[PDB]
Design a protein around this ligand. Structure first.
Ligand code: A3P
Length: 534
Protein backbone atom coordinates (compact mmCIF):
# COMPACT_ATOMS: atom_id res chain seq x y z
CA UNK A 1 0.00 0.00 0.00
CA UNK A 2 3.07 2.21 -0.32
CA UNK A 3 4.53 2.90 -3.77
CA UNK A 4 4.17 0.45 -6.65
CA UNK A 5 7.03 -0.17 -9.08
CA UNK A 6 6.33 -2.30 -12.15
CA UNK A 7 9.12 -4.05 -14.06
CA UNK A 8 8.86 -6.71 -16.78
CA UNK A 9 10.53 -9.73 -15.20
CA UNK A 10 11.09 -11.55 -11.91
CA UNK A 11 14.88 -11.33 -12.38
CA UNK A 12 14.72 -7.55 -12.80
CA UNK A 13 12.35 -7.27 -9.84
CA UNK A 14 14.80 -9.06 -7.52
CA UNK A 15 17.69 -6.76 -8.49
CA UNK A 16 15.95 -3.37 -8.55
CA UNK A 17 14.33 -4.26 -5.22
CA UNK A 18 17.82 -4.23 -3.67
CA UNK A 19 17.98 -0.46 -4.21
CA UNK A 20 14.41 0.42 -3.26
CA UNK A 21 13.36 1.00 0.33
CA UNK A 22 10.44 -0.21 2.43
CA UNK A 23 8.03 2.30 0.86
CA UNK A 24 8.44 0.50 -2.47
CA UNK A 25 6.56 -2.61 -3.63
CA UNK A 26 8.23 -4.02 -6.74
CA UNK A 27 6.02 -6.12 -8.98
CA UNK A 28 6.67 -7.62 -12.41
CA UNK A 29 4.34 -8.08 -15.37
CA UNK A 30 5.91 -10.81 -17.47
CA UNK A 31 6.33 -9.21 -20.88
CA UNK A 32 3.42 -7.85 -22.89
CA UNK A 33 0.20 -7.47 -20.92
CA UNK A 34 -1.81 -6.06 -23.82
CA UNK A 35 -1.43 -6.34 -27.58
CA UNK A 36 -2.95 -6.72 -31.06
CA UNK A 37 -5.17 -9.76 -31.80
CA UNK A 38 -12.63 -8.58 -41.88
CA UNK A 39 -9.00 -8.09 -42.91
CA UNK A 40 -8.99 -5.14 -40.51
CA UNK A 41 -10.73 -7.35 -37.95
CA UNK A 42 -7.91 -9.92 -37.94
CA UNK A 43 -5.05 -7.40 -37.98
CA UNK A 44 -6.51 -5.40 -35.11
CA UNK A 45 -5.46 -2.24 -36.96
CA UNK A 46 -7.24 -0.17 -39.64
CA UNK A 47 -5.08 1.44 -42.38
CA UNK A 48 -8.33 2.79 -43.85
CA UNK A 49 -9.60 4.58 -40.76
CA UNK A 50 -6.55 6.57 -39.61
CA UNK A 51 -4.91 3.55 -37.96
CA UNK A 52 -7.65 2.74 -35.47
CA UNK A 53 -6.29 -0.03 -33.27
CA UNK A 54 -8.00 -2.70 -31.19
CA UNK A 55 -5.79 -3.86 -28.34
CA UNK A 56 -6.72 -6.64 -25.95
CA UNK A 57 -5.08 -8.21 -22.93
CA UNK A 58 -3.00 -11.26 -23.85
CA UNK A 59 -4.65 -14.71 -23.65
CA UNK A 60 -4.87 -15.79 -20.02
CA UNK A 61 -3.02 -12.78 -18.61
CA UNK A 62 -6.45 -11.71 -17.34
CA UNK A 63 -5.20 -12.54 -13.83
CA UNK A 64 -2.03 -10.47 -13.93
CA UNK A 65 -4.04 -7.38 -14.87
CA UNK A 66 -6.31 -7.81 -11.84
CA UNK A 67 -3.44 -8.57 -9.45
CA UNK A 68 -2.07 -5.23 -10.67
CA UNK A 69 -5.35 -3.30 -10.47
CA UNK A 70 -6.17 -4.10 -6.84
CA UNK A 71 -2.50 -3.55 -6.04
CA UNK A 72 -2.18 -0.23 -7.88
CA UNK A 73 -5.19 1.36 -6.20
CA UNK A 74 -3.76 0.10 -2.92
CA UNK A 75 -0.70 2.11 -4.00
CA UNK A 76 0.34 5.71 -3.35
CA UNK A 77 2.19 6.35 -6.61
CA UNK A 78 2.86 4.05 -9.57
CA UNK A 79 6.36 3.81 -11.04
CA UNK A 80 6.72 2.39 -14.55
CA UNK A 81 10.20 0.93 -14.45
CA UNK A 82 10.44 -0.88 -17.82
CA UNK A 83 13.60 -1.07 -19.97
CA UNK A 84 14.68 2.34 -21.36
CA UNK A 85 13.99 1.84 -25.07
CA UNK A 86 10.79 2.62 -26.99
CA UNK A 87 9.75 -1.03 -26.59
CA UNK A 88 9.84 -0.68 -22.81
CA UNK A 89 8.05 2.63 -23.29
CA UNK A 90 5.11 0.92 -25.02
CA UNK A 91 4.98 -1.76 -22.30
CA UNK A 92 4.77 1.05 -19.73
CA UNK A 93 2.05 2.73 -21.76
CA UNK A 94 -0.01 -0.45 -22.03
CA UNK A 95 0.28 -0.96 -18.29
CA UNK A 96 -0.91 2.57 -17.56
CA UNK A 97 -3.83 2.26 -19.99
CA UNK A 98 -4.96 -1.07 -18.51
CA UNK A 99 -4.60 -0.34 -14.78
CA UNK A 100 -6.28 3.00 -15.43
CA UNK A 101 -6.46 6.07 -13.25
CA UNK A 102 -5.30 9.65 -13.76
CA UNK A 103 -2.00 10.46 -15.49
CA UNK A 104 -0.57 12.30 -12.48
CA UNK A 105 -0.81 8.89 -10.82
CA UNK A 106 2.11 7.59 -12.91
CA UNK A 107 5.81 8.32 -13.43
CA UNK A 108 8.26 6.72 -15.87
CA UNK A 109 11.68 6.07 -14.36
CA UNK A 110 14.66 5.69 -16.66
CA UNK A 111 17.92 3.82 -16.01
CA UNK A 112 20.46 2.12 -18.28
CA UNK A 113 21.99 0.09 -15.47
CA UNK A 114 20.53 -1.65 -12.42
CA UNK A 115 22.85 -0.40 -9.70
CA UNK A 116 22.58 1.58 -6.48
CA UNK A 117 23.45 4.95 -8.02
CA UNK A 118 21.48 4.36 -11.23
CA UNK A 119 18.25 3.41 -9.46
CA UNK A 120 18.64 6.27 -6.97
CA UNK A 121 19.00 8.96 -9.65
CA UNK A 122 16.21 7.33 -11.66
CA UNK A 123 13.62 7.46 -8.88
CA UNK A 124 15.00 10.81 -7.72
CA UNK A 125 14.19 12.65 -10.95
CA UNK A 126 11.35 10.52 -12.38
CA UNK A 127 9.91 11.49 -15.75
CA UNK A 128 6.70 11.03 -17.72
CA UNK A 129 5.72 8.50 -20.36
CA UNK A 130 7.12 9.65 -23.71
CA UNK A 131 4.30 9.44 -26.25
CA UNK A 132 6.63 9.81 -29.26
CA UNK A 133 8.48 6.64 -28.24
CA UNK A 134 5.23 4.78 -27.69
CA UNK A 135 4.01 5.93 -31.08
CA UNK A 136 7.29 4.83 -32.71
CA UNK A 137 6.83 1.33 -31.26
CA UNK A 138 3.16 1.23 -32.26
CA UNK A 139 4.08 2.34 -35.80
CA UNK A 140 6.68 -0.43 -36.10
CA UNK A 141 4.09 -2.81 -34.70
CA UNK A 142 1.42 -1.75 -37.21
CA UNK A 143 3.86 -1.89 -40.13
CA UNK A 144 4.84 -5.48 -39.30
CA UNK A 145 1.20 -6.43 -38.79
CA UNK A 146 0.17 -4.98 -42.13
CA UNK A 147 2.98 -6.64 -44.05
CA UNK A 148 2.50 -10.04 -42.41
CA UNK A 149 -1.30 -10.21 -42.76
CA UNK A 150 -1.36 -8.88 -46.32
CA UNK A 151 1.65 -10.67 -47.82
CA UNK A 152 1.74 -14.07 -46.08
CA UNK A 153 -1.59 -15.03 -47.77
CA UNK A 154 -0.10 -14.64 -51.25
CA UNK A 155 2.73 -16.95 -50.18
CA UNK A 156 0.14 -19.53 -49.05
CA UNK A 157 -1.56 -19.31 -52.44
CA UNK A 158 1.41 -19.20 -54.86
CA UNK A 159 3.83 -21.41 -52.92
CA UNK A 160 2.78 -23.20 -49.72
CA UNK A 161 0.80 -22.96 -46.48
CA UNK A 162 2.67 -22.01 -43.33
CA UNK A 163 4.93 -19.51 -45.06
CA UNK A 164 4.97 -15.96 -43.70
CA UNK A 165 6.50 -12.73 -44.96
CA UNK A 166 8.03 -10.15 -42.63
CA UNK A 167 8.68 -6.51 -43.45
CA UNK A 168 12.37 -6.70 -42.57
CA UNK A 169 13.10 -10.45 -42.56
CA UNK A 170 12.01 -10.47 -46.24
CA UNK A 171 14.75 -8.03 -47.24
CA UNK A 172 17.22 -9.97 -45.07
CA UNK A 173 16.45 -13.12 -47.03
CA UNK A 174 17.05 -11.15 -50.24
CA UNK A 175 20.55 -10.20 -49.02
CA UNK A 176 21.44 -13.88 -48.60
CA UNK A 177 19.74 -14.85 -51.86
CA UNK A 178 21.64 -12.25 -53.90
CA UNK A 179 24.92 -13.39 -52.34
CA UNK A 180 24.02 -16.98 -53.23
CA UNK A 181 23.39 -15.98 -56.82
CA UNK A 182 26.53 -13.82 -56.89
CA UNK A 183 28.56 -16.84 -55.79
CA UNK A 184 27.02 -19.30 -58.25
CA UNK A 185 27.52 -16.83 -61.13
CA UNK A 186 31.17 -16.16 -60.26
CA UNK A 187 33.72 -16.97 -62.98
CA UNK A 188 37.28 -17.48 -61.65
CA UNK A 189 39.97 -15.26 -63.24
CA UNK A 190 43.38 -16.83 -63.82
CA UNK A 191 46.44 -14.91 -62.63
CA UNK A 192 50.02 -15.75 -61.67
CA UNK A 193 52.37 -14.70 -58.88
CA UNK A 194 56.13 -15.03 -58.81
CA UNK A 195 58.00 -15.29 -55.54
CA UNK A 196 61.75 -15.19 -55.03
CA UNK A 197 63.64 -16.95 -52.26
CA UNK A 198 66.91 -15.15 -51.53
CA UNK A 199 69.87 -14.97 -49.17
CA UNK A 200 71.09 -11.92 -47.26
CA UNK A 201 74.78 -10.97 -47.10
CA UNK A 202 74.89 -12.67 -43.68
CA UNK A 203 73.06 -15.80 -44.82
CA UNK A 204 69.58 -15.26 -43.38
CA UNK A 205 66.74 -16.32 -45.70
CA UNK A 206 64.38 -13.74 -47.22
CA UNK A 207 61.22 -14.27 -49.25
CA UNK A 208 60.10 -11.62 -51.75
CA UNK A 209 57.13 -11.20 -54.04
CA UNK A 210 57.50 -9.67 -57.49
CA UNK A 211 55.34 -6.55 -57.49
CA UNK A 212 56.41 -4.42 -60.46
CA UNK A 213 57.94 -4.91 -63.92
CA UNK A 214 59.21 -1.90 -65.83
CA UNK A 215 57.45 0.21 -63.17
CA UNK A 216 54.04 -1.26 -63.96
CA UNK A 217 52.16 -3.62 -61.63
CA UNK A 218 53.24 -7.25 -62.07
CA UNK A 219 50.25 -9.33 -63.12
CA UNK A 220 50.98 -12.18 -65.52
CA UNK A 221 47.76 -13.95 -66.55
CA UNK A 222 49.18 -17.15 -68.03
CA UNK A 223 52.09 -19.60 -67.97
CA UNK A 224 53.66 -17.90 -71.00
CA UNK A 225 54.08 -14.38 -69.55
CA UNK A 226 55.18 -15.85 -66.23
CA UNK A 227 57.93 -17.94 -67.84
CA UNK A 228 59.24 -14.81 -69.56
CA UNK A 229 59.44 -12.86 -66.31
CA UNK A 230 60.96 -15.88 -64.55
CA UNK A 231 63.66 -16.16 -67.21
CA UNK A 232 64.73 -12.52 -66.77
CA UNK A 233 64.48 -12.79 -62.96
CA UNK A 234 66.72 -15.84 -63.09
CA UNK A 235 69.66 -13.87 -64.54
CA UNK A 236 69.03 -10.53 -62.84
CA UNK A 237 71.06 -9.12 -59.96
CA UNK A 238 69.16 -8.58 -56.71
CA UNK A 239 69.95 -5.53 -54.58
CA UNK A 240 68.01 -3.73 -51.84
CA UNK A 241 66.57 -0.54 -53.31
CA UNK A 242 64.89 0.49 -50.08
CA UNK A 243 64.27 -0.46 -46.46
CA UNK A 244 61.38 1.63 -45.11
CA UNK A 245 61.10 1.47 -41.33
CA UNK A 246 58.01 3.16 -39.87
CA UNK A 247 56.50 3.03 -36.38
CA UNK A 248 52.94 1.73 -36.69
CA UNK A 249 50.17 1.67 -34.11
CA UNK A 250 47.06 -0.38 -33.51
CA UNK A 251 44.16 1.20 -31.66
CA UNK A 252 41.65 -0.74 -29.55
CA UNK A 253 38.11 -1.09 -30.82
CA UNK A 254 35.28 0.99 -29.36
CA UNK A 255 33.28 -0.39 -26.43
CA UNK A 256 30.45 -2.65 -27.69
CA UNK A 257 27.00 -1.84 -29.02
CA UNK A 258 24.39 -4.42 -29.94
CA UNK A 259 25.63 -5.29 -33.43
CA UNK A 260 29.34 -5.36 -32.54
CA UNK A 261 28.60 -7.48 -29.46
CA UNK A 262 26.78 -10.04 -31.61
CA UNK A 263 29.57 -10.06 -34.21
CA UNK A 264 32.40 -10.57 -31.72
CA UNK A 265 30.37 -12.94 -29.55
CA UNK A 266 29.77 -15.09 -32.65
CA UNK A 267 33.31 -14.94 -34.02
CA UNK A 268 35.26 -15.06 -30.79
CA UNK A 269 32.87 -17.23 -28.71
CA UNK A 270 30.92 -19.17 -31.33
CA UNK A 271 27.73 -17.83 -29.73
CA UNK A 272 24.65 -17.60 -31.87
CA UNK A 273 22.94 -14.21 -32.13
CA UNK A 274 19.88 -15.22 -30.07
CA UNK A 275 22.11 -16.75 -27.42
CA UNK A 276 24.18 -13.58 -27.09
CA UNK A 277 21.15 -11.37 -26.46
CA UNK A 278 19.77 -13.93 -24.03
CA UNK A 279 23.00 -14.05 -21.99
CA UNK A 280 23.36 -10.27 -22.39
CA UNK A 281 19.88 -9.66 -20.99
CA UNK A 282 20.57 -12.12 -18.19
CA UNK A 283 23.67 -10.06 -17.30
CA UNK A 284 21.83 -6.75 -17.53
CA UNK A 285 18.89 -7.88 -15.40
CA UNK A 286 21.26 -9.13 -12.69
CA UNK A 287 22.83 -5.65 -12.67
CA UNK A 288 26.19 -6.66 -14.16
CA UNK A 289 26.14 -4.64 -17.38
CA UNK A 290 24.50 -1.60 -18.96
CA UNK A 291 21.38 -1.94 -21.14
CA UNK A 292 22.10 -4.30 -24.06
CA UNK A 293 20.02 -2.63 -26.80
CA UNK A 294 22.09 0.33 -27.96
CA UNK A 295 23.94 1.81 -30.94
CA UNK A 296 25.90 4.33 -28.84
CA UNK A 297 29.63 3.81 -28.32
CA UNK A 298 29.55 6.63 -25.80
CA UNK A 299 30.74 6.03 -22.23
CA UNK A 300 29.62 8.05 -19.20
CA UNK A 301 32.26 10.09 -17.35
CA UNK A 302 32.00 7.97 -14.21
CA UNK A 303 32.54 4.70 -16.12
CA UNK A 304 35.52 6.21 -17.91
CA UNK A 305 37.13 7.41 -14.66
CA UNK A 306 36.61 4.02 -12.98
CA UNK A 307 38.16 1.88 -15.74
CA UNK A 308 41.06 4.32 -16.11
CA UNK A 309 41.41 3.84 -12.37
CA UNK A 310 41.45 0.08 -12.95
CA UNK A 311 44.02 0.43 -15.75
CA UNK A 312 46.47 2.37 -13.56
CA UNK A 313 46.40 -0.14 -10.73
CA UNK A 314 46.57 -3.29 -12.82
CA UNK A 315 48.63 -2.32 -15.84
CA UNK A 316 50.50 0.87 -15.03
CA UNK A 317 51.46 4.21 -16.64
CA UNK A 318 52.40 3.07 -20.15
CA UNK A 319 48.90 1.62 -20.63
CA UNK A 320 47.01 4.71 -19.65
CA UNK A 321 46.30 7.22 -22.46
CA UNK A 322 47.06 10.89 -21.86
CA UNK A 323 43.40 11.84 -22.11
CA UNK A 324 40.44 9.42 -22.25
CA UNK A 325 39.55 7.70 -25.52
CA UNK A 326 36.28 9.10 -26.89
CA UNK A 327 34.37 7.21 -29.57
CA UNK A 328 30.91 8.75 -30.12
CA UNK A 329 28.40 11.13 -28.50
CA UNK A 330 25.33 10.21 -26.45
CA UNK A 331 22.99 11.21 -29.31
CA UNK A 332 22.01 8.42 -31.70
CA UNK A 333 18.87 7.20 -33.45
CA UNK A 334 18.01 4.96 -30.48
CA UNK A 335 17.19 5.61 -26.81
CA UNK A 336 20.32 4.17 -25.13
CA UNK A 337 22.96 6.80 -24.39
CA UNK A 338 25.78 4.44 -23.43
CA UNK A 339 27.66 1.49 -24.87
CA UNK A 340 27.49 -2.02 -23.46
CA UNK A 341 29.90 -2.17 -20.53
CA UNK A 342 30.17 -3.70 -17.08
CA UNK A 343 28.41 -1.84 -14.28
CA UNK A 344 31.54 -2.28 -12.14
CA UNK A 345 34.97 -2.93 -13.73
CA UNK A 346 36.07 -4.28 -10.35
CA UNK A 347 33.76 -7.26 -10.82
CA UNK A 348 35.47 -9.99 -12.84
CA UNK A 349 33.66 -12.60 -14.95
CA UNK A 350 34.82 -15.22 -12.42
CA UNK A 351 33.01 -13.46 -9.56
CA UNK A 352 29.53 -13.36 -11.12
CA UNK A 353 27.48 -15.45 -8.70
CA UNK A 354 24.16 -16.48 -10.30
CA UNK A 355 25.35 -16.80 -13.92
CA UNK A 356 25.86 -19.77 -16.24
CA UNK A 357 29.25 -20.38 -17.82
CA UNK A 358 28.20 -18.74 -21.09
CA UNK A 359 26.92 -15.52 -19.48
CA UNK A 360 30.32 -15.33 -17.79
CA UNK A 361 32.15 -15.78 -21.09
CA UNK A 362 30.08 -12.92 -22.55
CA UNK A 363 30.72 -10.64 -19.59
CA UNK A 364 34.39 -11.50 -20.05
CA UNK A 365 34.18 -10.36 -23.69
CA UNK A 366 32.25 -7.20 -22.70
CA UNK A 367 34.73 -6.47 -19.89
CA UNK A 368 37.86 -6.94 -21.97
CA UNK A 369 36.53 -4.82 -24.83
CA UNK A 370 35.59 -2.07 -22.37
CA UNK A 371 38.94 -2.05 -20.52
CA UNK A 372 40.87 -2.26 -23.78
CA UNK A 373 39.02 0.70 -25.33
CA UNK A 374 40.53 2.96 -22.67
CA UNK A 375 44.07 1.60 -22.91
CA UNK A 376 46.97 2.81 -25.07
CA UNK A 377 47.72 1.78 -28.67
CA UNK A 378 49.87 -1.23 -29.52
CA UNK A 379 53.13 -0.08 -31.13
CA UNK A 380 54.85 -1.94 -33.95
CA UNK A 381 58.03 -1.45 -35.94
CA UNK A 382 57.03 -2.01 -39.57
CA UNK A 383 59.57 -2.97 -42.21
CA UNK A 384 59.01 -2.78 -45.95
CA UNK A 385 61.78 -4.05 -48.19
CA UNK A 386 61.78 -2.94 -51.81
CA UNK A 387 64.13 -5.01 -53.94
CA UNK A 388 65.28 -4.45 -57.49
CA UNK A 389 66.17 -7.21 -59.94
CA UNK A 390 66.87 -5.97 -63.43
CA UNK A 391 63.61 -4.55 -64.76
CA UNK A 392 61.62 -6.04 -61.84
CA UNK A 393 60.51 -4.70 -58.47
CA UNK A 394 60.14 -6.99 -55.44
CA UNK A 395 58.88 -6.44 -51.91
CA UNK A 396 58.72 -8.03 -48.47
CA UNK A 397 56.82 -6.71 -45.45
CA UNK A 398 57.77 -7.23 -41.82
CA UNK A 399 56.46 -6.37 -38.38
CA UNK A 400 57.57 -6.87 -34.78
CA UNK A 401 55.55 -5.94 -31.68
CA UNK A 402 57.20 -3.19 -29.63
CA UNK A 403 54.45 -2.42 -27.05
CA UNK A 404 51.31 -4.51 -26.52
CA UNK A 405 49.18 -1.65 -25.23
CA UNK A 406 45.53 -2.71 -25.21
CA UNK A 407 46.34 -6.19 -26.52
CA UNK A 408 47.59 -7.20 -23.05
CA UNK A 409 43.99 -7.62 -21.86
CA UNK A 410 43.00 -9.67 -24.91
CA UNK A 411 60.00 -10.68 -38.72
CA UNK A 412 62.22 -10.09 -41.77
CA UNK A 413 65.98 -10.71 -41.55
CA UNK A 414 68.41 -7.79 -41.28
CA UNK A 415 69.62 -6.06 -44.47
CA UNK A 416 70.45 -2.45 -45.36
CA UNK A 417 69.77 -0.42 -48.48
CA UNK A 418 72.23 -1.38 -51.18
CA UNK A 419 72.79 -4.93 -49.93
CA UNK A 420 73.16 -7.62 -52.55
CA UNK A 421 70.83 -10.62 -52.31
CA UNK A 422 71.69 -14.03 -53.69
CA UNK A 423 68.89 -15.53 -55.78
CA UNK A 424 68.18 -18.99 -54.40
CA UNK A 425 64.96 -19.97 -56.20
CA UNK A 426 62.05 -18.46 -58.12
CA UNK A 427 58.55 -19.84 -57.45
CA UNK A 428 55.99 -19.09 -60.17
CA UNK A 429 52.47 -19.96 -58.99
CA UNK A 430 49.17 -20.17 -60.88
CA UNK A 431 46.09 -18.95 -59.02
CA UNK A 432 42.38 -18.25 -59.47
CA UNK A 433 40.38 -15.37 -58.00
CA UNK A 434 37.82 -16.44 -55.40
CA UNK A 435 34.03 -15.84 -55.33
CA UNK A 436 32.55 -13.40 -52.82
CA UNK A 437 32.77 -14.81 -49.31
CA UNK A 438 29.52 -16.21 -47.91
CA UNK A 439 27.71 -14.48 -45.07
CA UNK A 440 28.66 -15.58 -41.55
CA UNK A 441 26.34 -14.83 -38.63
CA UNK A 442 28.69 -11.93 -37.89
CA UNK A 443 28.92 -10.51 -41.44
CA UNK A 444 25.14 -10.70 -41.86
CA UNK A 445 24.59 -8.64 -38.73
CA UNK A 446 27.16 -6.15 -40.01
CA UNK A 447 25.40 -6.15 -43.39
CA UNK A 448 22.05 -5.46 -41.73
CA UNK A 449 23.58 -2.63 -39.72
CA UNK A 450 25.44 -1.13 -42.71
CA UNK A 451 22.35 -0.91 -44.92
CA UNK A 452 20.23 0.55 -42.14
CA UNK A 453 17.98 -2.50 -42.31
CA UNK A 454 18.43 -3.57 -38.69
CA UNK A 455 18.19 -1.93 -35.25
CA UNK A 456 19.53 -3.06 -31.84
CA UNK A 457 16.18 -4.68 -31.04
CA UNK A 458 15.80 -6.51 -34.36
CA UNK A 459 19.25 -7.75 -35.38
CA UNK A 460 18.87 -11.03 -33.51
CA UNK A 461 15.22 -11.63 -34.26
CA UNK A 462 15.82 -11.00 -37.96
CA UNK A 463 18.63 -13.56 -38.14
CA UNK A 464 16.86 -16.19 -36.04
CA UNK A 465 13.54 -15.91 -37.89
CA UNK A 466 14.86 -16.39 -41.44
CA UNK A 467 16.49 -19.64 -40.36
CA UNK A 468 13.43 -20.87 -38.50
CA UNK A 469 11.12 -20.21 -41.45
CA UNK A 470 13.54 -22.14 -43.65
CA UNK A 471 14.61 -19.43 -46.14
CA UNK A 472 18.26 -19.83 -45.22
CA UNK A 473 20.34 -22.35 -43.32
CA UNK A 474 23.74 -22.15 -41.66
CA UNK A 475 26.38 -24.78 -42.47
CA UNK A 476 30.00 -24.63 -41.26
CA UNK A 477 29.25 -21.22 -39.76
CA UNK A 478 28.27 -19.85 -43.18
CA UNK A 479 24.90 -18.87 -44.64
CA UNK A 480 23.26 -20.75 -47.49
CA UNK A 481 20.11 -19.52 -49.16
CA UNK A 482 17.63 -22.37 -49.41
CA UNK A 483 15.60 -22.92 -52.56
CA UNK A 484 12.47 -21.98 -50.57
CA UNK A 485 14.05 -18.63 -49.69
CA UNK A 486 14.95 -18.00 -53.33
CA UNK A 487 11.43 -18.83 -54.43
CA UNK A 488 9.75 -16.68 -51.80
CA UNK A 489 12.13 -13.82 -52.67
CA UNK A 490 11.41 -13.86 -56.43
CA UNK A 491 7.65 -13.99 -55.84
CA UNK A 492 7.86 -11.13 -53.33
CA UNK A 493 9.86 -9.03 -55.78
CA UNK A 494 7.18 -9.63 -58.42
CA UNK A 495 4.14 -8.67 -56.34
CA UNK A 496 5.70 -6.28 -53.79
CA UNK A 497 8.81 -4.73 -55.37
CA UNK A 498 8.73 -1.74 -53.00
CA UNK A 499 8.73 -3.98 -49.93
CA UNK A 500 11.74 -5.83 -51.32
CA UNK A 501 13.64 -2.60 -51.95
CA UNK A 502 16.62 -2.04 -49.59
CA UNK A 503 16.27 1.75 -49.50
CA UNK A 504 12.55 1.45 -48.75
CA UNK A 505 13.23 -0.75 -45.73
CA UNK A 506 16.01 1.49 -44.43
CA UNK A 507 13.84 4.59 -44.96
CA UNK A 508 10.97 3.09 -42.96
CA UNK A 509 13.39 2.31 -40.12
CA UNK A 510 14.68 5.90 -40.20
CA UNK A 511 11.11 7.22 -40.36
CA UNK A 512 10.33 5.18 -37.23
CA UNK A 513 13.27 6.81 -35.40
CA UNK A 514 12.06 10.19 -36.63
CA UNK A 515 8.68 9.51 -35.01
CA UNK A 516 10.50 8.53 -31.81
CA UNK A 517 12.57 11.72 -31.86
CA UNK A 518 9.66 14.08 -32.66
CA UNK A 519 10.76 14.73 -36.26
CA UNK A 520 7.74 12.99 -37.79
CA UNK A 521 4.20 12.00 -36.73
CA UNK A 522 3.28 8.30 -36.60
CA UNK A 523 -0.01 8.31 -38.52
CA UNK A 524 1.55 10.31 -41.34
CA UNK A 525 4.53 7.91 -41.40
CA UNK A 526 2.13 4.97 -41.46
CA UNK A 527 0.12 6.65 -44.23
CA UNK A 528 3.23 7.08 -46.35
CA UNK A 529 4.31 3.54 -45.51
CA UNK A 530 0.99 1.97 -46.50
CA UNK A 531 1.01 4.16 -49.62
CA UNK A 532 4.45 3.06 -50.86
CA UNK A 533 3.63 -0.53 -49.87
CA UNK A 534 0.38 -0.79 -51.87
N1 A3P B 1 6.85 16.86 -53.01
C1 A3P B 1 5.52 16.86 -52.80
N2 A3P B 1 4.85 18.08 -52.80
C2 A3P B 1 3.49 18.13 -52.59
N3 A3P B 1 2.65 17.06 -52.36
C3 A3P B 1 3.34 15.84 -52.36
C4 A3P B 1 4.74 15.65 -52.57
N4 A3P B 1 5.07 14.30 -52.51
C5 A3P B 1 3.92 13.71 -52.27
N5 A3P B 1 2.83 14.57 -52.16
C6 A3P B 1 1.40 14.25 -51.89
O1 A3P B 1 1.30 13.76 -50.56
C7 A3P B 1 0.29 12.70 -50.47
C8 A3P B 1 0.91 11.41 -49.87
O2 A3P B 1 1.74 10.76 -50.86
P1 A3P B 1 3.14 10.07 -50.53
O3 A3P B 1 2.89 9.00 -49.55
O4 A3P B 1 3.70 9.53 -51.79
O5 A3P B 1 4.08 11.11 -49.96
C9 A3P B 1 -0.28 12.54 -51.89
O6 A3P B 1 -1.58 13.18 -51.95
P2 A3P B 1 -2.93 12.57 -51.37
O7 A3P B 1 -2.80 12.39 -49.91
O8 A3P B 1 -4.01 13.54 -51.66
O9 A3P B 1 -3.19 11.29 -52.03
C10 A3P B 1 0.81 13.14 -52.78
O10 A3P B 1 0.39 13.58 -54.06
Amino acid sequence: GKALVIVESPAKAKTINKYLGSDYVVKSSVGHIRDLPALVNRMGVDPWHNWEAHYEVLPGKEKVVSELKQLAEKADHIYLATDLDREGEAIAWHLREVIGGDDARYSRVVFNEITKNAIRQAFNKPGELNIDRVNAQQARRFMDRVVGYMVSPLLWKKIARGLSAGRVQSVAVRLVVEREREIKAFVPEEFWEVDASTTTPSGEALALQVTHQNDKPFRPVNKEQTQAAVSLLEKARYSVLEREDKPTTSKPGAPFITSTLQQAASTRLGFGVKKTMMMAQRLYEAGYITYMRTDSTNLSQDAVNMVRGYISDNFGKKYLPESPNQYASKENSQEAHEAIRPSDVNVMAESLKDMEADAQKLYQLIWRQFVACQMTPAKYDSTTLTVGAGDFRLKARGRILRFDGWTKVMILPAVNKGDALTLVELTPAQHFTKPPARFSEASLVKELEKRGIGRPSTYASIISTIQDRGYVRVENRRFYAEKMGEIVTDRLEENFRELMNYDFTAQMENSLDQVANHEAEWKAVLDHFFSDFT
